Amino acid sequence: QVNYAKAADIAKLFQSVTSDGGSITVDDRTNSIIAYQPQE
Amino acid sequence: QVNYAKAADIAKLFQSVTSDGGSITVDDRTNSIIAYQPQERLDELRRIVSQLDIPVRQVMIEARIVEANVGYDKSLGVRWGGAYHKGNW
Amino acid sequence: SGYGKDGNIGIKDEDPFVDLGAKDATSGIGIGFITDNIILDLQLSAMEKTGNGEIVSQPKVVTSDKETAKILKGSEVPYQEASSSGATSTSFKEAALSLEVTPQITPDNRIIVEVKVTKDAPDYQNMLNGVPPINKNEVNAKILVNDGETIVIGGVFSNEQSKSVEKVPFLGELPYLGRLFRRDTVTDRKNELLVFLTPRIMNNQAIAI
Amino acid sequence: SEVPYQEASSSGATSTSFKEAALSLEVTPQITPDNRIIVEVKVTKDAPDYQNMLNGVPPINKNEVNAKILVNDGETIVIGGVFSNEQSKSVEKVPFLGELPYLGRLFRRDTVTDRKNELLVFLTPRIMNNQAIAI
Amino acid sequence: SGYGKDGNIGIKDEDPFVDLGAKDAT
């Protein structure tokens, strides 16, 4: 859960992570992102 | 049944659950979602549902304006008038 | 000359029972007069005004759940701009107390409600048919409270401290005469407005209905 | 009665407007088995304006509740209502004489006005199906 | 002078059975 981190920014982080090499859930209310994807 | 969790949010939880790997029923009146789908997906969605079923957060904002104005004005007119000798400033 | 209730007896010495009577008609006038030897008038003219107005109004509205219902107790302040070439701004708007509520009922007898709570009121300049500043105190917001529960949706305290002093400097300087030559006007007018709210679920009756 | 506004604006707009400041009930009842109704009801009281009768800028009176509520047929609820509590105080006083204990009353002018009006709307729906089914 | 029903007899001392009657009509 990120109150201080923008959800879009976290999404961009994962998108770049994908560029390195994959399920994403975004919670607007808590601004909490739950991602089920490789551990690394 | 989620009074505090938005139905769309729960739907998004299930959609991501599908992304992981499937019958959905949405009740607007009670905001209750009944899903007939694999147990594991159902449980995962339920846990997220629990997170979602959170009360909207109110905050009381008190911003106060303080204005202080102090004013001093002095004007002096100094006046010497005599017409007998026609001297007047 | 004084200022708060300005007086300078020399100017109307250019102009006692009649002139001073009217001159001193004002609320607070303390007259010292000599006329017999000389007419020398010395007055301390002071006014203190106190006004308190408190209005407490509570409207109760029965609303479906997640639906809007509205109570409006007012009158509809218009603006009639009848502009011949195609615009007839026969505008109106009701300066009414009102509650426009869209309650969402959550299990523990609570509601997150989007409520418009507005108090407005017909304008002098509108009644004047001038440029009308109508009064508006309105809060628009969605908040959560339990049904049994009252919260202050909002409120404001206005603290006014005003001071105005007018003084001939030289006489004002005099310790015994400065008060007699320093004109002080101090006004503090402070109005506070607060809005409560309590929602009582009618499902307690509506489920039984 | 129908409070109009006649803006007769030569170049194409004839706002021969009118609107009836009438008591009214506009009801859309839905009947549920236990002699109950969820009804969408407009309950409006409005009234001709002085400034309108004055042909000035008309603030017509409006007390209107628009809402859908459920009650049983045998049952009356308060659709809504409001109490207005007015407390007004105005005191005007020469300070020096007002200070005087025996003369301040004689030099303190008090105007206090409390005007409080409360308005409440009930409603009870009596199903005419009790007769309409038999009719 | 009063205020609620303002009165200040000096001003109309500049101006009893007739003046006060009307003045006091209120």
Contacts of E3 in chain D (CB under 8 A): 92, 109, 111
Experimental method: cryo-EM
**Cβ contact, residue pair A36, B52, below 8 Å:** no
Task: Measure CA C134 to chain center.
Answer: 12
Q: Which chains touch D (3 or more CB pairs under 8 A)?
A: C, E
Helix (H) or strand (E) holding A9: helix A7-20
User: CA nearest C132: which of B7, D14, D57?
Assistant: D57
Helix (H) or strand (E) holding A19: helix A7-20
Instruction: Measure the CA–CA gap between C65 and C63, rounded to whole angstroms.
Output: 6
Contact B16 A25 (CB under 8 A): yes
d(CA E10, CA E19): 12
Report the relative pairing of strands C162-167 and C191-197 from DSSP bridges.
unpaired
Of C105, C144, C169, the CB nearest to B56: C144
Question: Sheet of C69-83: strands edge to edge?
Answer: C135-146, C110-121, C87-106, C69-83, D60-72, D36-47, D24-32
Q: How many angstroms separate the CA atoms of C142 and C106, rounded?
A: 14
* Helical packing angle, B39-52 and B7-20, nearest 10°: 140
- C-beta separation of D68 from D38 below 8 A: yes
- In this complex, the chains that touch A, judged by 3 or more CB pairs closer than 8 A, are B
Distance CA B14, CA C7 (A): 84
Residue type, B56: V
Instruction: Specify the residue for token string 């008609």.
Output: C25
In whole angstroms, what is the distance from residue C2 CA to residue C9 CA?
A: 10
Q: Chains B, A in contact: 3+ Cβ pairs under 8 A? A: yes
DSSP letter for each residue of chain D: -EEEEEEEETTTEEEEEEEE---EEEEEEEEETTTEEEEEEEEEEEE--HHHHTTSS--EEEEEEEEEEEEETT--EEEEEEEEEEEEEEEEE-HHHHHSTTTSTTTEEEEEE---EEEEEEE----THHHHTT-
Experimental resolution (Å): 6.9
| CB–CB contact D72 C209 (8 Å) | yes
Task: Identify all chain C residues contacting B55, using CB atoms and an 8 Å cutoff.
Answer: 106, 110, 112, 144
Q: Which chain E residue shows the shortest CA-CA distance from D97?
A: E1
Q: How far is B43 from chain C (nearest CA, A)?
A: 22
Burial of C137 (0-12, 13-18, 19+ CB in 10 A): middle
Alpha helices in chain D (DSSP H): 50-53, 95-99, 129-132
Burial (0-12, 13-18, 19+ Cβ within 10 Å), B28: exposed
Asked if the C-beta of E4 comes within 8 angstroms of chain D's C-beta atoms, the answer is yes
- CB C59 to CB D67 under 8 A? no
Residue in D91, D92, D94, D106 to test binding to E, most E beta-carbons within 10 Å: D92
> What is the rounded distance in angstroms from the CA atom of residue A30 to the CA atom of residue A7?
10
Contacts of B among chains (3+ CB pairs under 8 A): A, C
Q: Are B39 and B70 in contact (CB under 8 A)?
A: no
Are C196 and C151 in contact by the 8 Å Cβ rule? The answer is yes
Residue E3's closest chain D neighbor by CA?
A: D109
The H or E element containing residue C119 is strand C110-121
**Which residues in chain E are closer than 8 Å to D110, comparing Cβ atoms?**
4
Amino acid identity, residue D62?
A: K
Three-class secondary structure of residue C103 per DSSP: strand
Q: Verify whether the Cβ–Cβ distance C54 to D88 is below 8 Å.
A: yes
SS3 E23: helix
Residue C117 burial by Cβ neighbours in a 10 Å radius (0-12, 13-18, 19+): buried
CB count, 10 Å around CB of B24? 15
> Is C76 at the interface with chain D, CB within 8 A?
yes
Which run of H or of E encompasses C196? strand C191-197
Residues of A in contact with B51 (CB under 8 A): 27, 30, 32
Q: How many CB atoms neighbour CB C55 within 10 A?
A: 14
Contacts of C144 in chain B (CB under 8 A): 55-56, 58
E chain contacts of residue D109, beta-carbon cutoff 8 Å: 2-4, 6
Half-sphere exposure of E2 (CA within 13 A, CB side): 11
CB of C135 within 8 A of CB of C95? yes
A5 vs B: CB within 8 A:
no
Measure CA of the first residue to CA of the last residue in chain E; give whole Å.
Answer: 16
What is the C-alpha to C-alpha distance for residues C186 and C47, in angstroms, rounded to an integer?
10
Per the CB < 8 A criterion, the answer to whether C17 and C26 are in contact is: no
B65: distance to nearest CA of chain A, Å? 28
Using the beta-carbon criterion (under 8 Å), do C112 and B56 form an inter-chain contact?
yes
Residue E6, number of CB atoms within 10 A of its CB = 13
